[PDB]
Paper text:
We mutated the exposed and partially exposed residues (P8, K15, R17, R39, K41, R42, and D50) to alanines because we expected that these substitutions would minimally affect the densely packed interior of the native protein45. The mutants were named according to the numbers of alanines in their sequences (i.e. BPTI-19A stands for a BPTI variant containing 19 Alanines) and a suffix ‘a’ or ‘b’ was added to distinguish variants containing the same numbers of alanines at different sites45. To provide a structural view of this peculiar instance of enthalpy stabilization, we crystallized and solved the structures of six simplified BPTI variants containing 19, 20, 21, 22, 23, and 24 alanines. On the other hand, despite repeated trials, BPTI variants containing 25–27 alanines merely formed needle crystals, unsuitable for diffraction. All six variants crystallized under the same conditions, indicating a minimal disturbance of the surface properties, even upon multiple alanine substitutions. X-ray crystallographic analyses indicated that all of the simplified BPTI structures fully overlapped and that the main change that occurred upon the number of alanines was an increase in the solvent content in the asymmetric units. The new water molecules were recruited around the alanine substitution sites and were involved in novel hydration networks. Thus, favorable protein–water interactions appear to be the most likely factor responsible for the increased unfolding enthalpy of the simplified BPTIs, rather than the relaxation of atomic clashes or the creation of new intramolecular hydrogen bonds or van der Waals contacts, assuming that the hydration structures remain the same for all alanine mutants in their denatured states.
Here, we report a structural and thermodynamic analysis of six extensively simplified BPTI variants, where 19–24 of its 58 residues are alanines, using differential scanning calorimetry (DSC) and X-ray crystallography. We used a stabilized BPTI- (BPTI- A14GA38V12), containing only the 5–55 disulfide bond, as the reference molecule instead of wild-type BPTI, which contains three disulfide bonds13, and a BPTI variant containing 19 alanines (BPTI-19A) as the template for further simplification. However, the alanine substitutions exerted a small unexpected enthalpy stabilization, and the magnitude of which increased in a nearly additive fashion along with the number of alanine substitutions, which was, however, over-compensated with entropy destabilization. A structural analysis indicated that new water molecules were recruited into the spaces created by the alanine substitutions, facilitating protein–water hydrogen-bonded interactions as well as interactions with the methyl group and creating hydration networks around the substitution sites.
Numbering used by the authors: 1001 to 1057
Amino acid sequence: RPAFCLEAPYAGPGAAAIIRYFYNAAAGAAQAFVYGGVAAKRNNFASAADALAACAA
């Protein structure tokens, strides 16, 4: 899969509490996490569907 999909989710430094999805290769599933609203990495999607389409080849 895309290497970015293997990275840990990144909340980043922002003050917001936004629910986003990362692909968790360990679980083989998309999972919610809290994103702070700034400096997203690529393993960070609006929905489980978007995460699987990008990362679950």
